[PDB]
Amino acid sequence: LPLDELRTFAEVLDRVKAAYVEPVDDKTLLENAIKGMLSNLDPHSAYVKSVKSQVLEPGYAYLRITQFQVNTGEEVVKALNQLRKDNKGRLKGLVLDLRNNPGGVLQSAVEVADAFLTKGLIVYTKGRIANSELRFSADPADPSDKVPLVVLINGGSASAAEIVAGALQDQKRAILMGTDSFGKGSVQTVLPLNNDRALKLTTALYYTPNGRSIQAQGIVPDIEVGRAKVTQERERPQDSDYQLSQALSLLKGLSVTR
Amino acid sequence: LPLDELRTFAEVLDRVKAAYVEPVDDKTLLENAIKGMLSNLDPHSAYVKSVKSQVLEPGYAYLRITQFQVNTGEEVVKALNQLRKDNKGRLKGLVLDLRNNPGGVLQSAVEVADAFLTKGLIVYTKGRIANSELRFSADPADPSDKVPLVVLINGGSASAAEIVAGALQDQKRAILMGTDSFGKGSVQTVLPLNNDRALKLTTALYYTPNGRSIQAQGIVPDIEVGRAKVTQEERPQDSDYQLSQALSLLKGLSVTRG
Amino acid sequence: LPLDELRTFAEVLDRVKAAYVEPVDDKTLLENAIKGMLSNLDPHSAYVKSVKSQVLEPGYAYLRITQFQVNTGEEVVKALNQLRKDNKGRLKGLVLDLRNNPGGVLQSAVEVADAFLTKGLIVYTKGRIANSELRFSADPADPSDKVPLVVLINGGSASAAEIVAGALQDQKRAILMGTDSFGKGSVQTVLPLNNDRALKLTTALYYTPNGRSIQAQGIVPDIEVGRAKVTQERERPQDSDYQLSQALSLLKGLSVTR
Amino acid sequence: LPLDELRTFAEVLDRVKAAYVEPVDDKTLLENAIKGMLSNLDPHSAYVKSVKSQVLEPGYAYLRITQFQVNTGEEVVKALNQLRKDNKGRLKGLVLDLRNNPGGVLQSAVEVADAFLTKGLIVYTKGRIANSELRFSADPADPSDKVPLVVLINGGSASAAEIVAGALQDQKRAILMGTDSFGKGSVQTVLPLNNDRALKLTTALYYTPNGRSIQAQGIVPDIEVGRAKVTQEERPQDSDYQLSQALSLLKGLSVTRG
Amino acid sequence: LPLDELRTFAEVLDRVKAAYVEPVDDKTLLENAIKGMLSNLDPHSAYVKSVKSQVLEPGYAYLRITQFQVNTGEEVVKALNQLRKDNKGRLKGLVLDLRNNPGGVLQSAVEVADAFLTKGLIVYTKGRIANSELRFSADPADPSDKVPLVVLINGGSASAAEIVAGALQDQKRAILMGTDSFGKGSVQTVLPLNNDRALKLTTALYYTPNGRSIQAQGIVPDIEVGRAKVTQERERPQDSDYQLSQALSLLKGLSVTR
Amino acid sequence: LPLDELRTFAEVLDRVKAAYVEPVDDKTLLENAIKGMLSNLDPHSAYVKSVKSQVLEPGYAYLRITQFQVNTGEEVVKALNQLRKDNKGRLKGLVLDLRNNPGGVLQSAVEVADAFLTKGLIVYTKGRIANSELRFSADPADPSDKVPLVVLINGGSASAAEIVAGALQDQKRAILMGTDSFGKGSVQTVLPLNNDRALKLTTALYYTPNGRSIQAQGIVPDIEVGRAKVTQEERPQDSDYQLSQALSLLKGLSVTRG
């Protein structure tokens, strides 16, 4: 209780209680002060097939994560094996379509990351409260079989998807190409109050294995690729998708070099 | 200041000070509570020749209010008589162009309304502060000489212009034509505080003679006519759809009224 | 017999009888003189569903007179009652489509006028001969039930239709909108001659109740509306017909005002 | 003047003077009878270097008659010999462009025709006045040197030009190609009257050597070829369809004639 | 054996035999010298329905020779009689489409020429060897019945077709219109050598009846007609074919003149 | 000179001298035999700042060889160090633009190759003349500092440029990207003859370190990327498709190589 600043606050509240057009009691003024304190502090504060896979070309395959549901992990691994069986042999290249992904279940995101990682950190949450600081390490099993993969990120790629992309980039496991990411990397917990109502507050934020806050930076692709049309001067989706075609050609060139 | 609910607000503020990710001191939380109490209460709260006239057709004339300045009233009357001299006789119809009129001097607004009204109320403010409750009644002189007129109002006409239009409509003096209006009919007083800072608070709001709040209702035209451009296959009605509609309505009204 | 001017005429006729390329007797020269005297004097001198009605919108109906036949009168009244039954109630507005109407039976025109008029003059013929000066007065029965109506006139609106429109305008019963009218308001009677052939001559002309000659003035609409296209900047025929849509909107505004 | 039928005409004129709507005196009726007797009898009755030549191709030349002036004849002959000098030898074919030729001096027309004819009639007028009947016979000199020629005639070629074309066609001297002609082949003499006013009357009309009246028949080309523009994928045949057709016809005619 | 020039040749051959990158024996050098001597001397040296006829318009018919096969002659005569039977009477005009004709059997070409010629030379071959100088004269039978015909030649008209066109032009029997011809008018005979291989050499060239070498001049049409589009300013193939339409109109005009 | 086969060649030449249509003397036949022996044997036989560099992105640079002049080598090295100074550190990737490079000084070519190679062969010529067989081995200094580079080759890159590219490819030093090359890898020496005239003969041809003849094989890029223009919806990769592909390949290669 600062009391002096509380005196200033109560004086402003009394002036409003006296002058406003429609009469307002103390309770509604207090509630509006609370709601606006939260709105001014933090915007997030208050008071269906998941996975689709396809072998786009012989040796090169495409895996898209529409959303992060609970089944998503098992489904991505199922898709990995399915693509390996479709190519009738080991894969030369893979594309992770994580663009247009709002986010979803954090555990499902971490297991999707685990399908590509054999060791190291994946994501860790930092905040100032007893049970916020969390960490997630990769298990020594990757169903990807070390396949070279390029991850696609758009503006509409946030939360869980951003975590996956960041983990894949910091482990130097994937090539991120596309535009920048949303940058939504904060966790909201509902805290209880003595009065019979509770408040939702961002209590911590996500951090990639390197240590860069997802919320501030976002995820910057290693190669920036905006939408564009190519003009020659000399199913199959890449004929219509610019970013997918670019990722495919990059994987092709990488395979040829390697 | 009821301390008992102050307990609830302090408890909530302390819980927020404890849980948020990046630490914030008591001062910023109190200041944000103030700013949001005002913001959540009221969005407006914080902490060129005026008239141009023309006789469109023999018997039918057009009066435009670009803005509400002090001269406006005199000029409007100067225009009225002038149009009577232009037609060399009494007018069969008149069009009040109040579209694209943000507002202006309130006294000029009541003067413009009073040039058409011989009795009754024009506009009245209701509020809870000591010296806000005021009223405006028409004087028994109308330089309009009882001419039938159509008033045109669009979205970009607010405050004073809405006061004029509402007065003309509720007094059954004019027929309003066009789209709905802005609906800005509130007065903000700057109130001083013990500390060397002040708060802007709406202290009263305007009401049309019927009793309809301009701020909530707005002024709804009797005839809805959206903006359009006509192309034949100076004379502004030949190019302006809304003005042409009002002119033709006045002509037909005059013919029936024989 | 002027005889001196007859001498001049006969001298010219003899010169022509002598000089022309192909020989011509006195009779053909006389006949050509007659035919050209008539052509030079007056151009008119010498020597199928009628009615369609529809309720275009709830409360507002449209009645078109393609042509003036004998049945036309009964048909317009039949249509009036039919439109009243279609709306399941009294009508708010009516449109008389008299455009593209060459004319027709005068009595049918006067009865069509009688469906809207309860008293007063309708049309009167004036000429200089025993039985030309005629008058037509409205009977005290109007099946229109005083419905407000707008009449549409084009360039191709003449004779009977022009009479109807003029009567409706001079009685201040309808609003005439559109372009100007044809202006054909003369009656041709065949007169008998001593020789076994007869001549058709305009013997009189029509006059509206006010007294304006239909032949000279034509019918000027109270509102002039040429064909045009409207461009918004925000069956059902009026969506395609400009004049009909204008008449509909005028009737709508009149109903709202009234 | 046979008074017995003058009775009929006077009776008719008096009946007209009696019946017409607006009164007209005897003088205007008599004057209109005169004007219409002439108008109904005959529509024409009431009360720049001339030649340019060029050799289109080796052996084939083009002679254009813009208008029929006095110099035209001499110039045409001057052109003929000149073309012979241009080709350095006798011509294989010649094109007479008589299109867009209103007419002109009749003597120049018979001269132009005579430059191609060695015997026979050229044109003769028939009428009933004393000194109109004239004839024109060709002199036994043709500077054309018997060259085969095609004459081009369109609608805008009348009188003198038609006289030339008709003479050339009926004498089987030229092949006419194009559309039909105007057909204006009549001569108007101004005749004086006892009163100080005169009348224009056609006193005779032209006839081609066959005997066909130019005024009624016109001159119909042996080959119909409408106007057109050709675009390859100076030389006027490269741009003019009718001239190109005539040139190709002359070339083929020359080849067959070997 | 010049021997001195043979010494120069053998010295050059020895220099090449010594210096070239890949070793070459005397035989391959000799063979290359031979092949290049032939290539440098003369390019031609080394070391399915035929006829379609149709009556395009009443009186005017069209005969196209796609190629010169053995049956071609009988087929053209068969077509002549067929067209005569189709028109149910003698023909007014005929078009020989010889354009886009590489050539073919010389005897078939000469018989096709014989279908139009009653006497005179058709084509003769000139060269310097015992049995090269040949001549071909027309037999006194022409199934064409002297019908006037126009022959069409394009750039792709060579050898046999060029011979036919040239014969028809030099006899002044047909009108050749179109663009210039290919100009391929040489005969290649294979000559035997002591060694077990032989050489093909142009031994003579064709000449038209006039004496102009087909190989050098080509066949120049009497009327030049490139592809073009006509624009009026006023099955049936000529509506789509410019050259065919021109030939048709020329035949029409020729028939009218004759 | 083996006279026995000289018999065959003389016999053939005499038969040709006897059979050809227009007579040709022995001299022209011998001269043509010479010219064609050279022409049939070998088609080539008969009888501006060089380097421009730029750092495209932080860590990635671009070096263009317009032409191979004497300064080129020095300039290339001057450019290499300069780019190292521009990036203020070692480069992550480099692009060698050898497209549109006809060739130039061979020593400058081996210098340009030597700026990237520390050991091994660069290019060697094979022929049969005395002093053609030469070899070029790399010196143990590479100013490239082992930077990974992609070389771009199109069709319009020949000789020296192909030598550089082939050396870089066979030494597994660079990844070649683009279309195939011209393939002009032969050296022509002018040889003198006893008579005062000389012959141009290819005396040797180039070979890449692998042993592949540049003239026959050409240099085939490891990655095929045709020319195209990209349009976003200075920086040349933003406009050049092939350069952008090489840049993205280098970036991905650098990321994987961590």
Automatic annotation (TrEMBL), chains B, D, F:
One GO MF annotation is: serine-type endopeptidase activity
**In its UniProt entry, what is this protein called?**
Probable carboxyl-terminal protease
Cross-referenced SMART domains: PDZ, TSPc
The Swiss-Prot or TrEMBL record describes its family as follows: Belongs to the peptidase S41A family.
**GO biological process, alphabetically ordered:** cell envelope organization; cell wall biogenesis; protein secretion by the type III secretion system; proteolysis; signal transduction
Which keywords, in A-to-Z order, does the entry hold?
Hydrolase, Protease, Serine protease, Signal
What NCBIfam families does the database record attribute to this sequence? prc (TIGR00225)
Alphabetized Gene3D superfamilies for the sequence:
2-enoyl-CoA Hydratase, Chain A, domain 1, 2.30.42.10, 3.30.750.44
Record Pfam families? CtpB_N-like, PDZ_6, Peptidase_S41
Instruction: Read off the InterPro entries from this record.
Output: ClpP/crotonase-like_dom_sf, CtpA/B_N, PDZ, PDZ_6, PDZ_sf, Peptidase_S41A, Tail-specific_protease
Q: Might you report a single GO cellular component term?
A: outer membrane-bounded periplasmic space
Species, as recorded: Pseudomonas aeruginosa (strain ATCC 15692 / DSM 22644 / CIP 104116 / JCM 14847 / LMG 12228 / 1C / PRS 101 / PAO1)
